[PDB]
């Protein structure tokens, strides 16, 4: 089917920046990013509809992170600016084939391997 | 617009329709063929439950897309029915995939059972090199 490969994670100081990449091996309709703390649940962070380019953000990251897509590279990104210690978590990108609400985790059928983002005080 | 047979076949394959949930590209083509003759603007009203079928796959505005005037509207595709009438079929395709997500599969479209089931659908993609 469709494989999603992530890269770009890292460990930074508060206020730092990172740019996560999610490269797909096949066609994707909606792409999104989720975060997860050790032993806790998956939380929606952002999404983008590849057809019209509409973007969606969680309140906690609005104004700090930017989700985008380079169709020529069939890759989706999460540009993380102004990182805060509270952003520390493992980040996962995911993709859907079916149409639906970009904020609904249930429509995401493909998932990346995850990448760690650590922000110190 | 009105796609050419092989042009649509290439586009659907490009949009991951080939084999999606077991449905071959041939079967999707046969569906589009009888549902709208490959016309993205195709629209059909239903003087029954007062709903409307939109696009190449004639997706109904009662449970899949929102046209803004259909009783019992759920809009599972979370899309405006008008988005399913564009020259770029990305949205229509994704909503079509949503439809077959359910147990009924492609049999959700009666036309498939009547015009595609147990038929030589390979012909719809034959000569396209897909």
CATH class as words, domain B1-130 = mainly alpha
- Among the residues of B3-116, which ranges form H helices? 5-14, 25-36, 90-99, 110-115
Is B53 in the active site?
Answer: yes
Chain-chain contact of A97 with B76 (C-beta, under 8 angstroms): no
Looking at the structure, give the CATH architecture of the domain made up of residues A1-121: Sandwich (2.60)
Q: What SS3 state is found at A11?
A: strand
d(CA A76, CA A95): 10
Of the partner residues B14, B16, B98, the one whose CB lies closest to the CB of residue A100:
B98
- Nearest partner of B95 among A79, A95, A97, A37, judged by Cα: A97
A11-33 burial code (b ≥16 CB/10 A, e <16):
ebeeebebebbbbbeebbbbbbb
Cβ neighbours around A110 below 10 Å, total: 19
DSSP codes joined into one string, A30-71? EEEEEEE-TTS-EEEEEEEETTT--EEE-TTTTTTEEEEEEG
B129: left (phi over 0), alpha (psi -120 to 50) or beta: left
Contact between A9 and A116 (Cβ < 8 Å): yes
Is B18 in the active site?
Answer: no
- Nearest partner of B79 among B95, B96, B102, judged by Cα: B95
- Structural element, H or E, at residue A97: none
Contact between A103 and A56 (Cβ < 8 Å): yes
| Residue A96 CB partners (closer than 8 Å, separation 6+) | A28, A29, A30, A31, A32, A107, A108, A109, A110, B94
Find the angle CA(A41)-CA(A110)-CA(B10) to the nearest 5 degrees. Answer: 160
A57 phi and psi angles, rounded to 5 deg: -135, 150
d(CA A111, CA A91): 11
Angstrom resolution of this structure: 1.9
Between the two ends of chain A, the Cα-to-Cα distance in Å is: 41
Technique employed here was X-ray
Chain-chain contact of A100 with B15 (C-beta, under 8 angstroms): no
Residue of B nearest to A104 (CA): B78
Domain segments of chain B as ranges: 1-130
Output the six-digit token pair for A99: 């149409």
Q: In chain A, which among 31-60 make CB contacts under 8 A with chain B?
A: 50-52
The residue count of chain A comes to 121
β-strand pairing of A115-120 with A10-13: parallel
Cα B118 to Cα B55, B115, B121, B123, distances in angstroms: 25, 9, 8, 13
Q: For chain A, say whether B77 makes contact (Cβ under 8 Å).
A: yes
Residues of chain A positioned with their CB less than 8 A from the CB of B94: 29-30, 51, 96-99
Percent helix, strand, coil in chain A (nearest 5)? 5, 50, 40
């Amino acid at each position: 089917q469709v494989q999603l490969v992530e890269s770009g994670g890292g460990s930074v100081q508060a206020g730092g920046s990172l740019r996560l990449s999610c490269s797909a091996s096949g066609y994707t309709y909606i792409s999104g990013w989720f975060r997860q703390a050790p032993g806790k649940g998956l939380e929606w962070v952002a999404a983008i509809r590849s057809s019209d380019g509409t973007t969606y953000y969680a309140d906690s990251v609005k104004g700090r992170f930017t989700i985008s897509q380079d169709n020529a590279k069939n890759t989706v990104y999460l540009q993380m600016n102004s990182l805060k210690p509270e952003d520390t978590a493992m980040y996962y990108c995911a993709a859907t084939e079916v149409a639906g609400w970009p904020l609904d985790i249930g429509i995401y059928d493909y998932w990346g391997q995850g990448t760690q983002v650590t922000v110190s005080s | 617009k009105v796609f050419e047979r092989c042009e649509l076949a290439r586009t659907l394959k490009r949009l991951g329709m080939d084999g999606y949930r077991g449905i071959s590209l041939a079967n999707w083509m046969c569906l589009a063929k009888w549902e709208s003759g490959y016309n993205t603007r195709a629209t059909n009203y239903n003087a029954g439950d007062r709903s409307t079928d939109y696009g190449i796959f004639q997706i109904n505005s009662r449970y899949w897309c929102n046209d803004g005037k259909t009783p019992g509207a759920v809009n599972a595709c979370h899309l405006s029915c008008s988005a399913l009438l564009q020259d770029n079929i990305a949205d229509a395709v994704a909503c079509a995939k949503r439809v077959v997500r359910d147990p009924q599969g492609i049999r959700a479209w009666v036309a498939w059972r009547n015009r595609c089931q147990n038929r030589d659908v390979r012909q719809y993609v034959q000569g396209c090199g897909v």
